[PDB]
Amino acid sequence: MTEYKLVVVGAGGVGKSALTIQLIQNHFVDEYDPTIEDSYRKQVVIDGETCLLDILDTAGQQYMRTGEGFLCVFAINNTKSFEDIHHYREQIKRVKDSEDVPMVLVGNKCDLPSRTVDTKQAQDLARSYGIPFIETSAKTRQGVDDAFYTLVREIRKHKE
Numbered sequence: 001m002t003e004y005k006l007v008v009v010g011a012g013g014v015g016k017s018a019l020t021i022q023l024i025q026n027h028f029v030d031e032y033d034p035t036i037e038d039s040y041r042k043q044v045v046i047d048g049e050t051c052l053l054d055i056l057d058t059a060g061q062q063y064m065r066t067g068e069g070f071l072c073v074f075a076i077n078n079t080k081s082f083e084d085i086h087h088y089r090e091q092i093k094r095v096k097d098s099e100d101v102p103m104v105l106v107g108n109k110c111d112l113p114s115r116t117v118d119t120k121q122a123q124d125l126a127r128s129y130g131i132p133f134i135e136t137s138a139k140t141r142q143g144v145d146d147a148f149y150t151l152v153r154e155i156r157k158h159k160e
């Protein structure tokens, strides 16, 4: 089956591992254990096609070389994580040496009322980048499948 190397990037505490754990193991880790690094494999069906997801859950600032699609995560209650997104995208473009790397902008923790980055602010950023924007919550699983599957679909269009 076709294998997809997905990389989850973003500032610390935004919910990178929470999103990955929820996708892979279907439960919410609410104890914050900062990730030195982690790497996960899961076989899924997206749009009827079977594939193997190879997911690297990175730390918040080689893995950029490997990945085929990038999940760039900020928390909607963390203004600096949203501002940090621009650094990650430029870092991805530098090592990929391309303006067209498959990636998805993810606004996590949408369950929280403590919002400082509003939905239209992030939608604007993703529009300039030419990538999709998904609001997610690792706590309630809203958008989690949508975020990773959209990244896989972005890779698909990019590959064809």
Ligand SMILES: Nc1nc2c(ncn2[C@@H]2O[C@H](COP(=O)(O)OP(=O)(O)NP(=O)(O)O)[C@@H](O)[C@H]2O)c(=O)[nH]1
Residues within 6 Å of the ligand: 010, 011, 012, 013, 014, 015, 016, 017, 018, 019, 029, 030, 031, 032, 033, 034, 035, 036, 058, 059, 060, 108, 109, 110, 111, 112, 136, 137, 138, 139, 140
């Ligand atoms: N309310 C809420 N809390 C969340 C959500 N996602 C993650 N958290 C919480 O956010 C904290 C950090 O989560 P974690 O997944 O470790 O974040 P990270 O972005 O992987 N951290 P790191 O960069 O250190 O490796 C934990 O308390 C986690 O339970 C969410 O959608 N909603």
Ligand SMILES: [Mg+2]
Residues within 6 Å of the ligand: 016, 017, 018, 033, 034, 035, 057, 058, 059
């Ligand atoms: Mg982590």
